[PDB]
Design a protein around this ligand. Structure first.
Ligand SMILES: Nc1ncnc2c1ncn2[C@@H]1O[C@H](COP(=O)(O)OP(=O)(O)OP(=O)(O)O)[C@@H](O)[C@H]1O
Ligand SMILES: Nc1ncnc2c1ncn2[C@@H]1O[C@H](COP(=O)(O)OP(=O)(O)OP(=O)(O)O)[C@@H](O)[C@H]1O
Ligand SMILES: Nc1ncnc2c1ncn2[C@@H]1O[C@H](COP(=O)(O)OP(=O)(O)OP(=O)(O)O)[C@@H](O)[C@H]1O
Ligand SMILES: [Mg+2]
Ligand SMILES: [Mg+2]
Ligand SMILES: [Mg+2]
Lengths: 289, 342, 47, 43, 359, 67, 96
C-alpha cells in the first residue's frame, strides 16, 4: 500500500509487486515458429499438445471426466533434437502467459534469494492464470541431493526444494502447467521425476529417415535452392544426424555455394556440406582408404 | 538539569578520555566524543555502562541503573526449570565436576585462594548430541542461589549492525551486577566457528560478537565471581581462541554411555517416576552393551508407555519394554549389516 | 620473553585473518606487520 | 602437561575434603586419577 | 434514494478528511520501568529511547514485552497495543483449507494411528499421559520414498482433528538479511504459545536440516544459525508448552543428528511404498470420481503396479482418462487402465531405484 | 571493425555460488547492446566440464556457469 | 605554489559555479519497476521503495521496467534514464 512520507496515511493501495527479474522473464512478443516449422515430431507433438494445451482450452471435458489434469511434462532428450524449438512453437500457438525461465537464472547470490525468485515466479503465474512455465536446462538445479560433511552445494538445494514445494504440496492452484527440457535425465533428483510433479516424460529421439528429409526441406526455404535437389538422397546421406546437425548442413552448403561463386545451391554443394559438417571435419588424406 | 528532557537515546560508555569528555556509542550505531554533564556521579562511569544521551547533540546527560538497558533478563521464577539433581540419573563424575567448577567457586572463593589453585572461569560441556549437556545445566539452575542469566547463542545476531557486541557487553554487565551469576550461552558453535569469510557482512558481524565475548571474558578479574557455561554438540567446530587459560579451561566430556552401571542407574531413575509393573525387569533390557545415549534410553521408555497405552493397559509390562528396544534402537548401520567383516 | 622479542603464535591463515579482522590473500601480511615491531619471533605449532 | 594436571588435581582433591593443605596421599590420589584418564583417553 | 445516498457519500468524504487530519505513530517494545513516568522502550527502527508515558495509559500493564505506540515527534507512549503476529506467520497459517479428508488417504492406516497417537491424543486426553507417567511427545518426523503421502497426510491433519495449523515450507523461512532466517522461526514458535494447541508443521526440512558442515561457506554458516535457533526452541532452557511439530522429508540421511535425536524428534513414523492390499485402496480412491464403465477389478493393475508410489497410481488414472479421450470415448474402459498402468510402469524405470534405510 | 570482447576461461570462475552465471549474463547483455560484437571465449577448458555425477557434487558451480 | 588535474594545462576554469549551482546534479540512481497505469514504482537500492511520477524532462514512453532512473534527491522524480548497470569486472574485458 502506498503511504504518505510524513503523516504515514495510507494514500492508496498497489498491485502485488514481484521481483523485477520475474517481470522480465514473461514473454511479450510471440516467437513466430508454428507447428509447421518443426518436422519429424508427430508422437511428441501430439503428446505435448494433448497434455499441456488441451487441458487449457477444453478443460470442461476433463472436469466432466472428473480427472486431474497433469501438472507438467518433462522433455528429456539428446542435445539438438527440438526440445527447445517445440517450446517455441507451443508458445506461438498457445493463448496464455508463457513465462520463460532458464534454470541457472534461478540460482542467485544470497541465501534464499533464489527461493524467493522461484516463489514469485509461480505467484505471478497464478496471478495471470492460466500459464505455461518453461524452466529450461532443469539439470542446473535438479541435481541429486546428497549427504556431505566436508562441503556441499546446500544453496542450490534450497531453490530445488522450493520448486518442489511450489509444483506440489499445499499450494497447487492446478492452473500453472510447467514444461521442462533437460538434456541429461540421468542426473535429475528422484523427487523431481515423481508424479504429481512433471508427469509426462516425452522422449525426443533422433530423427527418422523421412524426418531428416522433412527437416532439410523446412530449413531450406529462405535460401535460393535449385529445382533438382533430391531431398531423399540427402536425408539418406545423413545418418544419426540430430536436428541442428541438419541446419548446420544447410548453412554449410549455402556457404560453400557462395564461396564457389554459384548464384544458387546444387546437390553437389549439399553433399560437400554433408562432408563438412560430419565427423569428416578433418577430411583430407585419402591414404590407404 | 534541563537537557534531561524525556526524549533520550541510550548509549554505552566506552572510554573516559578527559574529566569532562567521553567516548560513547549511541544505539543509532556510530560512536561519538561528547561532553559529560557536570552533575553526574563520575564515579559511576564504568566501562560498558548504560548512560543516556541527548537527542541531537549526544552530550552525556544521565547515568542509568546498569540493570535497565538489558534486553536479556535474569531468569526469575516463572521460567524456573522443573528438573532436579535426583531426576538427572547417572553422570556422577560430570555432576561432581560441574558442582566443583560452578557452585563451589561461587560459594567459597577463599578456599580456592588459600589452597593456591586457580578458580575456573568457564566450562565447555561438550559431547555427542543427546547426553544431558542441557539438562545438567537445567538442574543446576533449579538449585543455584545465584542469578542464571540465560542467553541462547544465535539470539545475539540481528540485522541491525551494532546490536551484537552492544548486547554482549550488556549481558556481561548484567551478570557482573547480580554477582554471583552464571551465564549459559547455549549452542556456542553457531557463534564461534573456526572458518571465516572476510568479505561478507554475515561473518564480519559474528566476528565482532566473538571478539566482544572474548574481550569481556578476558576482562574477568580475580573477583566478580561470575562463571560462564556453554554447551555444544560439535567440539571441533570451535575457535581455538576459546580454549586458553583465563578463558574456558575446564572441559566436561559428556560421553555416550556404554557402562552397564550407568545405563542401569539412569533406567532405574526414569522407571521410578513412571509406572513400571512389578513383573518387569530392566536388567533383561540392559543385557546387551550398546552405545546407547542418555536421551534415547528415555525415549525408549516413552515409546514403551505409548505402546502400553495403545493396548489400553495403564501400566507398562515387560512385553512392551522388550518391543520398545526393537523399535528405538535397531542399528547404527556402519558395517554390522555385513557380518563377514568380522 | 627474556630476549625481549614479541612472540607471535600464528596457527593458520584463516585464524590469523579472523583474529586481526581483515582480509588477506597470502600469509606474508604477518611479515610486513611484524617488521615494524622488531625483534620478533614467529612460532607455528603442529598436532 | 600431565604433571601440571597432577598438581591441579591434587589441589582440587584437597578442596574436596574441605582441607587447608595439600598432602602426599592426595598427591597419590591425583596421580592415580591422571594416569587413569591418560591411559583411558588413549583408546 | 438520492438525498440519503448523497449523505452517505458525504459521510465517506468526511471520514477521508478525518483520516487526512490524523498522523502516524511508531511502534516499540517496553523493556523497563525506570519510574512512573520514565520508560525504556525499543523501536522497530532499532535505537532505544527513554520515553515519558501519557496520563491515561494504565501503568500496571507495562512490563518487558508489551507493544506500545510512540508519537513520532516527542516520542511519548500513547497506546497499549496487544501482542504482534508477524505477517510472514499469518501468510503461513492462512492457507486455503484443503478438501481431502482421512478417507482420501488409502493404505496408510497404521501410520495414521501412530501419528494420531501424538497429534490428537495429548491434545484431547492429557490424563493417561499422567498416571502412566510418559512425557508427552513433541516431534513426528514423517519420512519415506518421494510420493507416498508425507504431505497429503499433513493436509488431512490440517482439515481433520483441528487446532491452529501452521504449514511451514522449508525455504519459506530463509531470508537474505542477517538473522531474519531465525527471527521468523522465533515468531513461529511464539505464535504457538499464544494459540495452544498448535500443530506447527515444517516441510521438506532437508533444506534447513543438513548435517552442519565443518568447513562450509558463508551461506551454509548462516543457515546453521537457523538450525540452532530451531533446535533450541524444542529442548532448550524452556519447555514447549503444548506445541506439536510434524516434520517431513524424502532423504532422512542428510539430517543433522542433533535434530534427529529421540527427544527433539519423537516417534519417527515411516510412510513406506504401498504394498498390494494398500494399492487396491489407492486404485479405488483415485478411480471413483472417474466415469467407470466396467467391472473394474484392479487385481491385474495391483499385480503390475509393483513399487508404485501413491501419486503414480493417480497418474495411471490420468493416463487412462487421456487414452479414453484419444478414442473420443467419454468414460474410461477397463482395458484402458491397463495401457496407462503399463505406460507409467515403463517410465518408472527412469526414476532412480528408490533406496532408503529404516532409521 | 567490431567490438572484440575477450573472455579468459578462468575469469568466469568466481567464488560465491552463481556468480559465473551473472558474469555470462551481463557479458552477453553488453555484447547485445552493440550493433556487431565478436566474443573470444578462450580457454573454455576451464568452464567446459562435461556434465557428470560423483555423489559429492564435484565442481557443480562451474557446471552451472557452463549451462 | 596529488589530487587534481593539471594547472599548466589549465582547463580547470572557475566557471564551474555555473554547472554547480544547479543542485539537480545529485540524482539518486534506482532501478524502476512495475509501471502502474501514470505512476512509477522506484526501488532505491537501500533507502526506500518510493512510488513516483515523472519530472517533465523525460518522455513518458522512455521509462520501462528494469531501466535505471536518475531519481531527483528532494521531492523524488524520474528525471533521466540511465544505461543498464554493468558489472565493472565485465568492462576491462573489452580490447581498446
Ligand atoms: N524437428 C526439428 N525441426 C526443425 N528444426 C529442428 C528440429 N529439431 C531440431 N531443430 C533445430 O534445432 C535448433 C535448436 O535446437 P534446440 O534448442 O531445440 O536443442 P536442445 O538440445 O533442446 O538445446 P538445449 O539443451 O541447449 O536447450 C534449431 O536451429 C532448430 O532448427
Ligand atoms: N541422565 C539422564 N537421565 C535421564 N534422562 C536423560 C539423561 N540425559 C539425558 N536425558 C534425556 O534427554 C532429554 C533432554 O535432552 P538433553 O538435555 O539430554 O540434550 P543434550 O544432550 O543437551 O542436547 P544438545 O546437544 O542437542 O543440546 C530428555 O528427554 C531426557 O529424558
Ligand atoms: N495413500 C494415498 N492415497 C491416495 N493418493 C495418495 C496417497 N499418497 C499419496 N497420494 C497422492 O500424492 C499426491 C500428493 O503428494 P505426495 O503425498 O505424493 O507428496 P510427498 O511424498 O509428500 O512429497 P515430497 O517428496 O515433496 O515430500 C496427491 O496427488 C495424492 O493423490
Ligand atoms: Mg534446446
Ligand atoms: Mg541439549
Ligand atoms: Mg511432499
Amino acid at each position: 500500500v502506498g503511504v504518505n512520507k510524513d503523516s504515514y496515511l495510507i494514500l492508496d493501495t498497489l498491485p502485488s509487486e514481484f521481483d523485477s527479474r520475474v517481470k522480465a522473464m514473461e514473454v511479450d512478443e510471440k516467437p513466430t515458429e508454428t507447428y509447421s516449422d518443426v518436422g519429424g515430431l508427430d508422437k511428441q507433438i501430439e503428446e505435448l499438445v494433448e497434455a499441456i494445451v488441451l487441458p487449457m482450452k477444453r478443460a470442461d471435458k476433463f472436469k466432466d471426466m472428473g480427472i486431474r489434469a497433469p501438472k507438467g511434462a518433462l522433455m528429456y532428450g539428446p542435445p539438438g533434437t527440438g526440445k527447445t524449438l517445440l517450446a517455441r512453437a507451443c508458445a506461438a500457438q498457445t493463448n496464455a502467459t508463457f513465462l520463460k525461465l532458464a534454470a541457472p537464472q534461478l540460482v542467485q547470490m544470497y541465501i534464499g534469494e533464489g527461493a524467493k525468485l522461484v516463489r514469485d515466479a509461480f505467484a505471478l503465474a497464478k496471478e495471470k492464470a492460466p500459464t505455461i512455465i518453461f524452466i529450461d536446462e532443469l539439470d542446473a538445479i535438479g541435481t541429486k541431493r546428497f549427504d556431505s560433511e566436508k562441503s556441499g552445494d546446500r544453496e542450490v538445494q534450497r531453490t530445488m526444494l522450493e520448486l518442489l514445494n511450489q509444483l506440489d504440496g499445499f499450494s497447487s492452484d492446478d492452473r500453472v502447467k510447467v514444461l521442462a527440457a533437460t538434456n541429461r535425465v540421468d542426473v535429475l533428483d528422484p523427487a523431481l521425476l515423481r508424479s504429481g510433479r512433471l508427469d509426462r516424460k516425452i522422449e525426443f529421439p533422433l530423427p527418422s529417415e523421412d524426418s531428416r528429409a522433412q527437416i532439410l526441406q523446412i530449413h531450406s526455404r529462405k535460401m535460393t535452392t535449385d529445382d533438382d535437389i533430391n531431398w531423399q538422397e540427402l536425408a539418406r546421406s545423413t545418418d544419426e544426424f540430430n536436428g541442428a546437425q541438419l541446419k548446420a548442413v544447410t548453412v554449410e552448403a549455402g556457404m560453400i555455394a557462395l564461396r564457389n561463386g554459384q548464384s544458387s545451391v546444387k546437390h553437389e554443394d549439399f553433399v560437400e556440406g554433408i562432408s563438412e559438417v560430419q565427423a569428416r571435419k578433418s577430411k583430407s588424406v585419402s591414404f590407404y582408404a | 538539569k534541563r537537557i534531561q528532557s524525556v526524549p533520550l537515546v541510550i548509549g554505552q560508555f566506552l572510554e573516559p578520555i578527559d574529566q569532562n569528555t567521553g567516548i560513547v556509542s549511541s544505539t543509532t550505531g556510530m560512536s561519538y566524543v561528547v561532553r559529560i554533564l557536570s552533575t553526574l556521579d563520575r564515579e559511576l562511569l564504568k566501562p560498558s555502562m548504560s548512560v543516556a544521551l541527548h537527542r541531537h547533540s549526544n552530550a552525556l546527560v544521565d547515568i542509568l541503573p546498569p540493570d535497565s538497558d538489558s534486553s536479556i533478563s535474569v531468569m526469575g521464577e516463572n521460567e524456573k526449570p522443573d528438573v532436579t539433581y535426583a531426576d538427572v540419573g547417572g553422570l556422577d563424575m560430570q555432576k561432581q565436576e560441574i558442582r566443583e567448577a560452578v557452585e563451589l567457586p561461587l560459594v567459597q572463593a577463599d578456599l580456592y585462594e588459600q589452597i593456591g589453585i586457580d578458580p575456573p572461569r568457564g566450562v565447555l560441556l561438550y559431547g555427542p548430541p543427546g547426553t544431558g549437556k542441557t539438562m545438567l545445566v537445567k538442574a543446576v539452575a533449579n538449585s543455584t542461589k545465584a542469578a542464571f542469566i540465560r542467553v541462547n547463542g544465535s539470539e545475539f545476531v540481528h540485522k541491525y549492525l551494532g546490536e551484537g557486541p552492544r548486547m554482549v557487553r550488556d549481558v556481561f554487565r548484567l551478570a557482573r551486577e547480580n554477582a554471583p551469576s552464571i551465564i549459559f550461552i547455549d549452542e556456542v558453535d553457531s557463534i564461534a566457528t573456526k572458518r571465516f569469510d572476510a568479505q561478507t557482512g554475515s561473518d564480519r558481524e559474528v566476528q565482532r560478537i566473538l571478539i566482544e565475548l572474548l574481550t569481556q571474558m578476558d576482562g574477568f578479574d580475580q573477583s566478580t565471581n561470575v562463571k560462564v557455561i556453554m554447551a555444544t554438540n560439535r567440539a571441533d567446530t570451535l575457535d581455538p581462541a576459546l580454549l586458553r587459560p583465563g578463558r574456558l579451561d575446564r572441559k566436561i566430556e559428556f560421553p555416550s554411555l556404554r557402562d552397564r552401571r550407568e545405563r542401569r542407574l539412569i533406567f532405574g531413575t526414569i522407571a521410578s517416576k513412571m509406572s513400571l509393573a512389578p513383573e518387569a525387569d530392566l536388567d533383561s533390557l540392559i543385557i546387551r552393551n550398546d552405545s546407547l545415549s542418555g536421551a534415547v534410553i528415555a525415549a525408549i521408555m516413552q515409546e514403551a508407555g505409548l505402546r502400553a497405552v495403545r493396548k489400553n493397559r495403564y501400566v507398562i509390562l515387560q512385553s512392551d519394554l522388550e518391543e520398545a528396544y526393537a523399535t528405538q534402537v535397531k542399528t547404527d548401520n556402519t558395517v554390522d549389516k555385513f557380518d563377514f567383516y568380522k | 620473553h627474556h630476549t625481549d622479542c614479541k612472540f607471535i603464535r600464528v596457527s593458520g591463515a584463516e585464524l590469523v585473518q579472523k583474529y586481526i579482522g581483515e582480509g588477506s590473500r597470502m600469509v606474508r601480511e604477518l611479515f610486513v606487520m611484524a617488521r615494524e615491531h622488531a625483534p620478533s619471533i614467529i612460532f607455528m605449532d603442529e598436532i | 602437561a600431565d604433571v601440571k594436571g597432577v598438581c591441579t588435581e591434587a589441589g582440587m582433591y584437597a578442596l574436596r575434603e574441605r582441607r587447608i593443605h595439600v598432602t602426599q596421599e592426595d598427591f597419590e590420589l591425583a596421580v592415580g586419577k591422571v594416569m587413569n584418564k591418560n591411559q583411558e583417553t588413549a583408546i | 434514494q438520492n438525498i440519503r445516498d448523497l449523505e452517505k457519500l458525504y459521510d465517506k468524504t468526511e471520514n477521508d478528511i478525518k483520516a487526512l487530519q490524523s498522523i502516524g505513530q511508531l511502534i516499540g517494545e517496553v523493556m523497563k520501568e525506570l519510574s512512573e513516568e520514565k520508560y525504556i522502550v525499543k523501536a522497530s527502527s532499532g535505537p532505544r529511547y527513554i520515553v515519558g508515558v501519557r496520563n491515561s495509559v494504565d501503568r500496571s500493564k507495562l512490563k518487558k514485552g508489551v507493544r506500545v505506540t510512540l508519537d513520532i515527534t516527542t516520542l511519548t507512549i500513547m497506546r497499549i497495543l496487544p501482542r504482534e503476529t508477524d505477517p510472514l506467520v499469518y501468510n503461513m497459517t492462512s492457507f486455503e483449507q484443503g478438501e481431502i479428508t482421512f478417507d482420501g488417504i488409502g493404505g496408510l492406516t497404521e501410520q495414521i494411528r501412530e501419528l494420531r497417537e501424538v497429534i490428537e491424543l495429548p491434545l484431547k486426553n492429557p490424563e493417561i499421559f499422567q498416571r502412566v507417567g510418559i512425557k508427552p511427545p513433541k516431534g513426528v518426523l514423517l519420512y519415506g520414498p518421494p510420493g507416498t503421502g508425507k504431505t497429503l497426510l499433513a493436509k488431512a491433519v490440517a482439515a481433520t482433528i483441528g487446532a491452529n495449523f501452521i504449514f511451514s515450507p522449508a525455504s519459506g523461512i530463509v531470508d537474505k538479511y542477517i538473522g531474519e532466517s531465525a527471527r521468523i522461526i522465533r515468531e513461529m514458535f511464539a505464535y504457538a504459545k499464544e494459540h495452544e494447541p498448535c500443530i506447527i508443521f515444517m516441510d521438506e526440512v532437508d533444506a534447513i536440516g543438513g548435517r552442519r558442515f565443518s568447513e562450509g561457506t558463508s551461506a551454509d554458516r548462516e543457515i546453521q544459525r537457523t538450525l540452532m535457533e530451531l533446535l533450541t526452541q524444542m529442548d532448550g532452557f524452556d519447555n514447549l508448552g503444548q506445541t506439536k511439530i510434524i516434520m517431513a522429508t524424502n532423504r532422512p540421511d542428510t539430517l543433522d543428528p542433533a535434530l534427529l535425536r529421540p527427544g527433539r524428534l519423537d516417534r519417527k513414523v515411516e510412510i513406506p511404498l504401498p504394498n498390494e492390499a494398500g494399492r487396491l485402496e489407492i486404485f479405488k480412491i483415485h478411480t471413483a470420481k472417474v466415469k467407470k464403465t466396467g467391472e473394474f477389478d484392479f487385481e491385474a493393475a495391483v499385480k503390475m503396479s509393483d513399487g508404485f508410489n501413491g501419486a503414480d497410481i493417480r497418474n495411471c488414472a490420468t493416463e487412462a482418462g487421456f487414452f479414453a479421450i484419444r478414442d473420443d470415448r467419454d468414460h474410461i474402459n477397463p482395458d484402458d487402465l491397463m495401457k496407462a498402468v503399463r505406460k507409467v510402469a515403463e517410465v518408472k524405470k527412469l526414476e532412480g531405484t528408490i533406496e532408503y534405510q529404516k532409521l | 571493425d567490431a567490438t572484440f570482447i575477450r573472455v579468459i576461461g578462468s575469469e568466469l570462475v568466481q567464488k560465491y555460488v552463481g556468480e559465473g552465471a551473472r558474469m555470462v549474463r551481463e557479458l552477453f547483455e553488453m555484447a547485445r547492446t552493440k550493433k556487431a560484437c565478436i566474443i573470444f571465449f578462450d580457454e573454455i577448458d576451464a568452464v567446459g566440464g562435461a556434465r557428470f555425477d560423483d555423489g559429492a557434487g564435484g565442481d557443480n558451480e562451474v557446471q552451472r556457469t557452463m549451462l | 605554489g596529488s589530487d587534481t588535474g593539471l594547472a599548466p594545462s589549465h582547463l580547470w576554469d572557475i566557471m564551474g559555479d555555473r554547472q554547480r549551482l544547479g543542485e539537480e546534479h545529485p540524482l539518486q540512481v534506482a532501478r524502476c519497476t512495475k509501471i502502474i497505469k501514470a505512476k512509477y514504482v522506484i526501488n532505491l537500492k537501500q533507502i526506500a521503495k518510493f512510488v513516483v511520477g515523472l519530472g517533465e524532462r523525460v518522455s513518458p514512453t522512455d521509462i520501462e521496467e528494469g531501466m535505471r532512473v536518475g531519481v531527483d534527491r528532494s521531492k523524488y522524480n524520474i528525471e533521466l534514464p540511465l544505461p543498464p548497470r554493468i558489472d565493472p569486472s565485465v568492462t576491462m574485458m573489452t580490447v581498446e
